[PDB]
Write a protein that binds this ligand. Sequence first.
Ligand SMILES: [Mg+2]
Lengths: 173, 175
Amino acid sequence: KSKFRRICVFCGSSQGKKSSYQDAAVDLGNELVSRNIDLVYGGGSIGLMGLVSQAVHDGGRHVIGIIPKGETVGEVRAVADMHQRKAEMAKHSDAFIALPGGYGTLEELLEVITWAQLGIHDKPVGLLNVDGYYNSLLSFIDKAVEEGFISPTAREIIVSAPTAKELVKKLEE
Amino acid sequence: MQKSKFRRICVFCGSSQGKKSSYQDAAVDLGNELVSRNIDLVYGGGSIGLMGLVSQAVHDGGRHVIGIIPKTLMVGEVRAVADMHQRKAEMAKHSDAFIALPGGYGTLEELLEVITWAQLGIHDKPVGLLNVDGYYNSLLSFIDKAVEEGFISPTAREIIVSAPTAKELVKKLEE
Ligand SMILES: [Mg+2]
């Protein structure tokens, strides 16, 4: 049995131009279903977001979408604002994984990393770096670990892998 | 004869001062740019790393400085709010634009949050990067990618303004 009851997945509300990223989202969803882990997410039915949330739901697992202020599958939670949204999503998950996404996923994925670095939480954090999507952002962190702004230890907060299967294999340890 | 359209700008940055003095000079020049433009500061609230260099530079220059700190722990004014989220909200509400000097996870998260809100149209405050010796080059390239793969609209990439010096950066923010 997985040490996680729920994993908060941040990802593209857009589907992207490559079916490769779309298949990853679906696979990640099936990985949660198989490992008996439920899904926490930002809600809605659009983009890689829809796929994984629908994939997890279709597989029979529980899905919770937390929105601020398309349709959200599973249990929906509407909160005050985007701050409360990130507050809530992070207060009910046992790990955070980001799939390729845009500014949205970045910020959320970074606040959580900053929170894990500051001690606020120690949940694992992972990047599903498919087709090299996150390569640069991943080198920038290194540029940040080289110049003196991020410690080699905090850099390790970021777990990465090219596929959902292997990716979860690392978070579980 | 010159007036900036900014009552105050918010500055985020590295808890450290970076390994290159070129980064420290950029934080000093940035504060001297705000002063030279009669722009006050909206920053965190410490005396270490780059934060200290830019806030003290603005203070010495005789401009107003406001630093918001989470009341958890513990120049110019000092405010303490409940949590880290209320911190960003105040800092964002009390400033006209946003700029980032080199920094780590926290700086990058403060930045992506205000940039993301501009994307959603919540606010229209300019956001800029003080690119010291190419520090953010790879971040700018990742975004370029996040534009080619269809996750960041061609226009949303233009939210991030950037330049190698504080003067060159504030001119771009002015528009
Ligand atoms: Mg841990």
